[model samples]
Target: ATFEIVNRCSYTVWAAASKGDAALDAGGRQLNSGESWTINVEPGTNGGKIWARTDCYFDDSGSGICKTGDCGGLLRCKRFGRPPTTLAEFSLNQYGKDYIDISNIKGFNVPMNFSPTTRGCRGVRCAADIVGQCPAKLKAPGGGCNDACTVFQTSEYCCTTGKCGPTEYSRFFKRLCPDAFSYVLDKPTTVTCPGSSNYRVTFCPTA
Candidate 1:
């Protein structure tokens, strides 16, 4: 499977991705507006995630900081990006289908759209203006809205146990982007496609 990371925001964005135990793609390149990076993934690749880093300042040797979505202070992420990031997650060839979702369960930093390039597949997006409308309590220090679980860390918010329901915080996210995974228990967020599908992931996609 192949994934194209497209940046449509006004400013530059550092696109990053990780699959299983492999090194991060792009080495955290400065993906200028309208530019893109592509990564090819093996079939049955699992635990894949893609996210963007913003407000970054790096040294010549590829060491530095990011205002949001910093991954271990390295250009090439050895771990998942920090919270308040919009995540594009996938599990390819799992149980006979490709599972995918745009997740805000850890909170949202940027808007994104994920869809297969192949025909007959439905597109999923979470392009709401979440930063502007972010709730006061859940706001992150650098930028974006932190998910309720990150803020409250309660059983109800985290759904750590059996059959937990949504709280006002989770409802707030759902109201803005109904297609995303607003919380751990968010059921309507997942989508499936035939195995080995090629996908396009766009940051800050327009309406």
Candidate 2:
């Protein structure tokens, strides 16, 4: 399988992805406006995630920080990016289908859309303006909207306790992007397609 990462915003974006302990296109790269990059994935690759980083300043050794979605201060992320990032998650060849979602459970930085490259599958997206309208309590220092868990750090917000559910803050994100996962227990966020299909993830998609 393959994931095509597209940048539709006016500025540049750094694309990142990971699968299990392995990194797909490990060294992050910049995608200019209207540009795209594709990464190949092995069969039955599960626990893969893709996201975008913005306003990054790296040195010759590829060591620096990103304003949003910094993964351990390295250009090539060995782990998942930090919160306040829009996420595209997938598990390929699971039960003969590919499960995918645009998740905001970690909160949102940029708007994003996930779709199949060809026909035979429905698309999912979370293209709302999260930064401009982020709640005061859930806002990040530089940019993006922090998840409720990051903000409050309580059992109620983190869902670490028994039968945790969404609060008013999580509902705020859900109302904006109904198809995205606004909280940890947001069950309706996932979508599945034929395993044979490739996928496209667009950051900062048009209105």
Candidate 3:
């Protein structure tokens, strides 16, 4: 899969991507508004991810922290970034198809758009003003919104009993981004492609 990461935010964003423990070339990179980066992964890989970090500063040696989406506070992230982050998650070339989706279960920061640039299914995007309208208890320190699973931590919100469905919290997210995974075991809503397609992720998407 080929992924082109673009930034349209008013401020700078540090983009991060990972598959399992393996990080991208530099793990991540700094992108000012309108800047973009590309990454390609061979077939058969799963758990592909892309996200953006905001209000961050990294030293020459690449060590720093971001207000959102920081991975061990390293400029060159070596693991899954901690959220309060909007996510573009995918699994490419699995059984002749590719599965992709925007995720809020980890939380949300920037508005995002994700889709195939080549042959694929209809794209998915989340352009809601989630941060500004964030629920009181699920608010992040600097910005972004938190998932009820982490903030509430009850089986009712966490799905620990596997009996939960469409709670108020999930409705809040789904109402805005019906295509996103609002919670654990949230309705599938995953889009698929014929495999071997180029894709793009846009931060602060306007449409």
Candidate topping TM-score: 2
TM-score of candidate 1 versus the correct structure, residues matched by position: 0.94
**How much lDDT does each candidate structure score?**
0.85, 0.86, 0.86
CA deviation > 4 Å runs, candidate 1? 24-27
Which pairs clash in the backbone of model 2? none
lDDT by residue (85-132, candidate 3, tens digit) is: 888989988999999999998889999999889875878999999888
Q: How well is each residue in 56-77 modelled by candidate 2, as lDDT tens digits?
A: 9889898999999998888877
Model 3, which residues run further than 4 Å from truth? none
Show how many residue pairs clash in every candidate, following the order shown: 0, 0, 0
Instruction: Name the weakest run of 10 consecutive residues (lDDT summed) in model 1.
Output: 20-29
Please, what are the lDDT tens digits per residue for candidate 1 over residues 36-93? 8887777887888888999988888888888888887877776788888899998899
Cα deviation in Å at residue 73, candidate 2? 1.0
Q: Which 10 consecutive residues of model 2 have the lowest summed lDDT?
A: 19-28
Every model: Cα RMSD to truth: 1.6, 1.3, 1.4
The local lDDT score (0 to 100) that residue 95 gets in candidate 1 is 77
Clashes of 1: 0
- Could you tell me the lDDT of residue 178 within candidate 3? 89
